[PDB]
Amino acid sequence: MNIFEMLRIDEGLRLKIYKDTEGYYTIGIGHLLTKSPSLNAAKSELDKAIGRNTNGVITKDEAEKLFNQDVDAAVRGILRNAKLKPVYDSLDAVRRAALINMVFQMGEATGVAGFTNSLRMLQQKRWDEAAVNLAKSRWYNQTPNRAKRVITTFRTGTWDAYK
Numbered sequence: 606m607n608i609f610e611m612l613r614i615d616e617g618l619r620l621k622i623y624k625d626t627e628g629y630y631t632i633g634i635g636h637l638l639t640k641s642p643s644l645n646a647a648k649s650e651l652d653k654a655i656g657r658n659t660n661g662v663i664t665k666d667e668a669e670k671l672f673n674q675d676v677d678a679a680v681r682g683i684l685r686n687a688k689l690k691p692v693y694d695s696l697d698a699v700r701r702a703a704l705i706n707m708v709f710q711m712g713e714a715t716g717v718a719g720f721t722n723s724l725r726m727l728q729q730k731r732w733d734e735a736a737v738n739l740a741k742s743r744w745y746n747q748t749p750n751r752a753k754r755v756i757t758t759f760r761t762g763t764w765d766a767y768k
Contacts, residue, residue: 606764608676608702612709614767615751618668622647622661626748632661633668636675637712679705682714689718692728700727703758710751711744727759736760 616635622644625631630638630647636654638647651659655667663671683689683704693704704727707717718724720742726735736756739745745752757766 606767608705609672611702611764611767612672612676612706615706615710615754618665620663620665620668622651632663632671634672634675635709636668636671675709676705679709683708686714686718688721688724689714692724695728695730697762699762699764700759703755706755706758707744710748732760732762 613634618634619632622630622632622638625635625637629640630644630650632638632651638650638654641647648659648661651661651663654671655663683693689704689708693701696704704717708714711717720739723735723738726738736759739756739759740752742752745756754766758764
């Protein structure tokens with residue numbers, strides 16, 4: 606198991622524009638296109654991302670290409686964030702993947718950098734406590750199964766939730 610497999614499990618793979626759990630236009634492996642309610646806006650953003658006139662449909666290779674960029678971006682976003690960086694560097698490899706998962710989901714470092722208290726607990730390696738704190742969130746209330754998977758990963762440092 607690794608970050609790519611993990612997120613592929615959490616996000617699924619869809620080749621035609623769809624709406625995410627928040628109703629936003631998305632494609633591929635969780636690639637958010639736009640927060641706009643306009644399908645045409647989403648089709649424009651898609652074509653711009655792929656570099657062709659897609660008509661709302663992409664191939665598997667294309668999906669994977671967006672996915673790789675998106676994982677890079679999430680990691681880079683963490684390394685560039687003053688709050689996230691030290692946490693991430695303090696973590697073991699498994700848990701690092703849990704943190705990338707959150708940033709990818711929340712599509713931005715910002716979101717996650719906000720979870721101050723949980724961040725501090727993770728850095729201190731107080732796993733059970735962090736796990737409880739993380740669950741007191743809109744995040745855990747809206748997508749509870751996915752959040753449980755990510756929280757278990759932080760609590761245990763293993764991939765058991767994904768196995």
